[PDB]
Every structure is written in C-alpha cells, then in structure tokens.
Ligand binder design. Sequence first.
Ligand SMILES: O=C1C(O)=C([C@H]2CC[C@H](c3ccc(Cl)cc3)CC2)C(=O)c2ccccc21
Ligand SMILES: O=C1C(O)=C([C@H]2CC[C@H](c3ccc(Cl)cc3)CC2)C(=O)c2ccccc21
Ligand SMILES: [Co+2]
Ligand SMILES: [Co+2]
Lengths: 383, 383
Amino acid sequence: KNPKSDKFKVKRFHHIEFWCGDATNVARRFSWGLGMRFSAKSDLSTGNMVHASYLLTSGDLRFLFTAPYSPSLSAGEIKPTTTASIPSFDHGSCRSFFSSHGLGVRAVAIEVEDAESAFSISVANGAIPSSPPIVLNEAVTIAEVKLYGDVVLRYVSYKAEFLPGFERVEDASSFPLDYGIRRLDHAVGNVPELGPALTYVAGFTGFHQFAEFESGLNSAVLASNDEMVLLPINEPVHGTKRKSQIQTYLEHNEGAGLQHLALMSEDIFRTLREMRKRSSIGGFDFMPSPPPTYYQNLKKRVGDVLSDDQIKECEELGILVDRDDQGTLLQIFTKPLGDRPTIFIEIIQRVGCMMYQSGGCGGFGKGNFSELFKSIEEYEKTL
Amino acid sequence: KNPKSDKFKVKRFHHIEFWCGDATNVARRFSWGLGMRFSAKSDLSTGNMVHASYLLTSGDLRFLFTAPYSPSLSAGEIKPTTTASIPSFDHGSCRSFFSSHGLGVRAVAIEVEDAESAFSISVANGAIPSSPPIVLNEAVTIAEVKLYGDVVLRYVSYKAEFLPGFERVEDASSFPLDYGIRRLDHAVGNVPELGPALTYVAGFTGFHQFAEFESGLNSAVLASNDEMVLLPINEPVHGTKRKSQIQTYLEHNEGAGLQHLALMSEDIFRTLREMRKRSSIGGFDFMPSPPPTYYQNLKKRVGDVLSDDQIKECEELGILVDRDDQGTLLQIFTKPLGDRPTIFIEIIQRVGCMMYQSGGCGGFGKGNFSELFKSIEEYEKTL
Ligand SMILES: O=C1C(O)=C([C@H]2CC[C@H](c3ccc(Cl)cc3)CC2)C(=O)c2ccccc21
Ligand SMILES: O=C1C(O)=C([C@H]2CC[C@H](c3ccc(Cl)cc3)CC2)C(=O)c2ccccc21
Ligand SMILES: [Co+2]
Ligand SMILES: [Co+2]
C-alpha cells in the first residue's frame, strides 16, 4: 500500500556530502576505492576562501567531500560577500561536527521541484530548519532541514554542472575510473528511538512506510511517492546477549547519524572484483564472508534466479542474497570507512520488479539474519 | 667545518607523525601514493580507547598517522590508567592542532642514545618542554620538546617492533608495496624569523650549521654530528615581485610549521615512474616540469655524471638536477599533500660522497633557482 502522500514533489537522490578534516585525502581514497571519477571542485583555485569541496561521480552517484580552511582566510567576509560555494557551510559547525562524529555524512541531498517550497512546507509541518533557502546565481536553490542527529536533509532545485561556483575538473586530473556503481539506492540512519524519529521525518515529508516481507535492532523505511528515495532508520534492541551494533554506533558516533550508504551497481560481480583487488592497496575492506554452508543453501532459495556458476561467483566474492516476493537482492557490506566503527557502505544489485525497475525490489536483506544463523549452525555441525 | 658539538648522542631519524582528523583515510592514500606498507597499528582493536595510530614503512622510513577518538571512550581514564600507546597524546592538543593547521606533521622523531638525558640536556639548554620522558613497558623511552610552531622534536631511545602497545599488522592486510623509497633525508620548517629559530634549536641540540655551496626566502641547515639528521629552516623574503611561498605557507598554516619532507629513493627513476602512474588514481601530483631548455642545459652541467639516456629519462619524469663540489643531487617536488598549500614532499637521490654516503651529498638544490630562471629566459627566446 502506497498512499503517495509526499507533501512536495521529490525527484531523486542528488548527492551525499561528507564533512572531513582534509577533503583531498578522503576524496582520493574514495575515488580509488570505489571507482569514482573527480568531476568538479570548489576551493582556493576557484576563488573559494572558505571551504575545499571535491565532487566524485559514478553514473548518477555524487559524493561531495568538504573541509574548512583557516577562518583567517575569510575573516573580512560576511554572508552577503561570502566566497563559499555552499552558503550553508559554517566553519564552527563543520569543526564541531567532525570533532564530535569524525568522518561522516553531513547532508543527504534530494532533488526537488522547488527547494523554497519544500523548505517552507517541511518547516510548516514540523521540520527543524537548518539553513534557509538561498538562490545561487539565479540558477539553483538550496535549503536544509534537520534529519537526525547532526545530519541534514538538503533540498536542491534547478530552474533549468553541479552547483554554481564549482569548476569542471581538467581531464588530465580526471581519470575515468568506473567499477560499475551507478546510483544511491538508500541511506540509513541510526537513532536511539525509532518511533519519534519516524514520526518527525514522515511528519514533515509525507513519506510513507515502505513495509517489509531477533538480534540487533528494529528498523523501518520511509519512502517517497515512487519509492526511489528510500530512508531506512534503525534503533538498537537492548538487553540481548551480543551487544547491539546500533548501540556501538551511537556510542562511537556520539549520538544519532547516518549508518550506511547503499550503492547500486549495474554489475555487482565486476564491482566486487574491482573493489576487492584494491582493499589492501588503499581501497575498502569487506566484512567477513559467510560460511560455505550459506552458499550450500543458496541453490534451494534462489536457484531459479541464478545459475550454479553465478552462485559460485557469489561465493568467491562473499556476496549475500535475499529474496522478496517480487524480487531478489544481491548485497555486501564494507568494513567501516574511517577510524570509528560508525559509517560503512553497502553494494547492492536488484533483480526483478520490471515495469524501469521499481524501488526497493527485493527488500533490504533482513532475511539474511536467519539464513546466516542457520549457516553457522550447519557449518558447526559439518566441522 | 663540522665542530661535532651535539650535546647528546643522536642516531638517525626515527619516524614522522602526522596529526589527522581521520588516520585511516590519510594512511591509505599515502600508502598507495608513496608505496609504503602497513606495518603496525594501535587502535580500538588493540585496546587503545584514546587514539587511532597507523604506521607505514618503506625501507627505514616510518610515517605514523594518528587521530583522536571521542573523548567519551576514555572518560574514566587518568594518565596513570591510560590506554593510549603514545602517552604524549592529548585530545585537546590534537584537535586544536588540526583545526589550526589542517593535516600536517606534529612530530619529527629522532632516535637517541637516552631520551631522558636528551630531554634534560635539551631543557637545560633552552628547549621548551612539551612532554616529559616516559618509559613504555620498561623498553622504550619517549620525550618531546618544542621545535617550531606546534611541531615537536621527539626523542626515542631503546634499551635493546615500533612501540609497546602497537601490534604487527596481519599480512593479509599488509600488501608489500614498494616504489623504492628508503629513508628520510631531511625535514624542513618554515618560520617567520630565521635567526631566532636557528638560535633556539642549535642552542639546545648543539647541531651545527651545515653551510651551502634572489627570489623567495632565506634558509639555513642544522645538522647532527655525522650530518645524518638534517633540519633546514626557511624564512620569507618580503617585498619581492612574486609573493614569497614561505609567506603563503605561514598564512595558510596559521604560523610556523613543517614545510616539506625529503624522502631518499634507492632508484629515483623507478620511484617517479611508480608515483606518476598513480597521480590521478589516488596518489600524489607533482609540480610542473621545467622547460626542455632546462634539460637542454643539463648536458653542460652534469654530462659527466649521467649519460644522455639518463638525462632524457630525467626529462620524461620532470626531475631536477643540481651539483655540489663533492656530489650531485636528483630531486622533484610534489604538489601539497592536503587541502592547504602548506606541506609537500620531495623525492631525492644523491650520487657521490662515498667513504657509506655522507649526509647532504650534493646540497639541497638551491642552484636550481638560477638554472630554472635561465631555462625560462632561453625557452622564451626559442618561442
Ligand atoms: O538497509 C538495511 C540493511 O542493510 C539491512 C541489513 C542488516 C545486516 C544483515 C546481514 C549482514 C550480514 C550477514 Cl552475514 C547477515 C545479515 C543484512 C541486512 C537490514 O536488515 C535492513 C532492515 C530494514 C531496513 C533496511 C535494512
Ligand atoms: O631543502 C631545501 C630545498 O628543497 C630547496 C629547494 C627550493 C625549491 C628549488 C626549486 C624547485 C623547483 C624549481 Cl623548477 C626550481 C627550484 C629547489 C631547492 C632549497 O632551496 C633549500 C635551500 C636551503 C636548504 C634546504 C633547501
Ligand atoms: Co541496507
Ligand atoms: Co629539500
């Protein structure tokens, strides 16, 4: 059931912004590790005396990395005379965010029909304002409201390449890396209490619950009208045996924040081959693979969707597989992206739900909990 | 003239410590860009609740990358009960350093015969104490004094692998990258006033002036007894036509600090080939190459040291060449390592002065200023 109750016209995920201490080094690591190319910049060389911002792209996926310069470079400026290309940026907020959370997502940006209207309607419906709408070069409008913790939901709207004040990156500096990643599928937050977080966000967006099919947490998913903007939220489940990874996150992050980004690949086998080749030479590490008993049980679950050769290829790369009632999902998780056990990345590919592919095809993998536990039991029995 | 006036026994450069906001991402970028392997760690997985520290090595070169965790993880601890593996570390100092300077060198560490004696003699002779000697697991002693700006000179001494509390990195996580870099040759500071900086440091070390052979700056070099620990210092020259790059550094760094690290390669052609292949895929960029007229003048200067084939190989890679009265120097400079136009790296190889090779063989390249200017004039004439 999709009531299509969006309070303003939402299009697609637009970009994710990381707040960094040094944007150069994080962006270069991510570029190599994920196969994203350098496509735009806003920094001292472009006249920005406030922040250094570097944009990576792969297909439709846009990762922005921003760090502050010394406030002394822009001490004469006021907001009317700022050289910042992102007017919501504030040195104090950025330094406070990073000292509090370390490397993490500051903004989940969605493209909307009219960012000023989205902002007004959102705040009229309970959203906590973070940055009021501002029009950039009479071309783009940007506004921000709080989402959870210190993460903001950023509205972007275009009258008619990233943002004014950003420069195209000279092709000699822009190597065409591509491991197959094509778009952001979903962005997941961790909170202390799921209920109030859901009520708040669904309250001001009109996003509806997406609805699914005991260890770790409780979650739920909010979705836009066409279910292309997907925002899951997790809360911990306390008092288990094995400590909730959601609670570990909240401790090490100093509170709520973005837990993981799920990136859709047009060929998850190629993506995982390319990323795993680079894990020990600057790229990203992946979580430990499930036991072969897990893959020794995949034939009985998705043997009609993947050949035995494709299932053995899943086993080589450590891919997990889950299944909805309309689709099938292939997924895998990285280890945390930075020093703290907080944010990580998921690589995903979905098969089914063709009409274009509808959003959320196959679910989010929650059936992999029971499957993994069964795998462990069976493997211990075979030991 | 080498008066050999060291006030305590100094051995060799031991390590350089960068203070970071996220040590993981900087260390992975540097590892790939420079061809250094991951060899030790001290972090949450080793019981360190205070800081994340990752050690990269290439030959004898040791780069340490450190970032703070949330203070809340170690809120119960006191200095007697600390889980930090580097007892001089302080969350407040590290966050203040990084917000003030961005990514940069916090410590230039030298191995000494007795770090407690070095510290006492240094402070007795004018050094400003930064961290008093502390003995780690009855095995290693570490102490720190201020060097310039917020950079410290760190003394390390061993009774008899990096530091207690650091763990060997599991070989699966430790890929054996190597582009030929083998040791730190020199470490250079930028200061507002050269005279007082020299007086202070030579005052407490007993290091002597190393002594050489109009645009940018004035410099001088302090050296240990065998001239294997080399510490150049630069000051700006004001009132030129083209603004001093030393003054630009001081502005963007918010004051004095470490300007560049010069890394000796056992094969500078292989190193530069390997680093340049990776410049646009996560590694380091190099400064623009001198005009071919420069290389069209190398035969008349070092034609007796390098064949014409080796000189054309210098031209491909953009290497500069200078010459002492005892040796010849091959060198090249990276673009700044991070967001700010502050710290960069120099790759160097020295030929001559065999007895082992004596330190500073060939000088530091200061003759390349005049040579480059002449190159520009000649190239403009040929245009
Ligand atoms: O986005 C996700 C998501 O990524 C998982 C994940 C959690 C980890 C699970 C898992 C990972 C690895 C193994 Cl070996 C077993 C299970 C797989 C599904 C969920 O369970 C989930 C539930 C509800 C809404 C969204 C989501
Ligand atoms: O360590 C150095 C050093 O690295 C340079 C450098 C400065 C930049 C010069 C240069 C670089 C590039 C070109 Cl195209 C021309 C000159 C080469 C020497 C010095 O001039 C110097 C002088 C005195 C003590 C130490 C040092
Ligand atoms: Co997910
Ligand atoms: Co030098």
